[PDB]
């Protein structure tokens, strides 16, 4: 009933980062390869004639 | 003359006591108001009220 007669609660930010798991990953890198896909077709531009 | 003197003191006491009692009557409600105000303040200490609360 008097000013200051408190009992207190503390709270913590809990998430993927405060636990140090936001980049928890277990994958292994693939070996990458690329090839030249040939583009085709024609498109319609803004300019008039 | 002495009897008139006593009568005068009686009149003074009547007018006086008309007050005093009035002041207790008002101050009783004043007291209860202040008490409930204290209660509201205690409520205000709740650490988990919203701003509109």
Rounded Cα distance between A19 and A12, Å, is: 11
**Sign of the dihedral through C-alpha A4, B47, A8, B39:** positive
Resolution in A, one decimal? 2.9
Q: How far is B24 from chain A (nearest CA, A)?
A: 27
Hey, what are A34's tokens?
């690329």
Q: In A, which residues are within 8 Å of B42 by CB distance?
A: 1
| Pair A9, B47: CB distance under 8 Å | yes
Hey, what are B7's tokens?
């009568």
Partner-chain contact A1 B42, CB within 8 Å: yes
| Pair B34, B40: CB distance under 8 Å | no
Q: Find the residue in A nearest to B44 (Cα).
A: A3
Q: In the PDB record, what is the listed experimental method? A: cryo-EM
């Amino acid at each position: 009933a008097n000013d200051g007669e408190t009992i207190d609660i503390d709270l913590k930010q809990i998430n993927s980062q405060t636990l140090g798991l936001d980049t928890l990953n277990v994958q292994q890198k693939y070996k990458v390869s690329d090839t030249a896909a040939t583009v085709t077709g024609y498109a319609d531009t803004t300019i008039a004639l | 003359q002495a009897q008139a003197q006593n009568s005068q003191y009686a009149l003074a006491r009547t007018f006086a006591t008309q007050k005093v009692s009035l002041e207790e009557s008002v101050l009783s409600q004043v007291t209860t108001a202040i008490q409930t105000a204290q209660e509201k303040i205690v409520y205000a200490g709740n650490g988990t009220l919203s701003d509109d609360d």
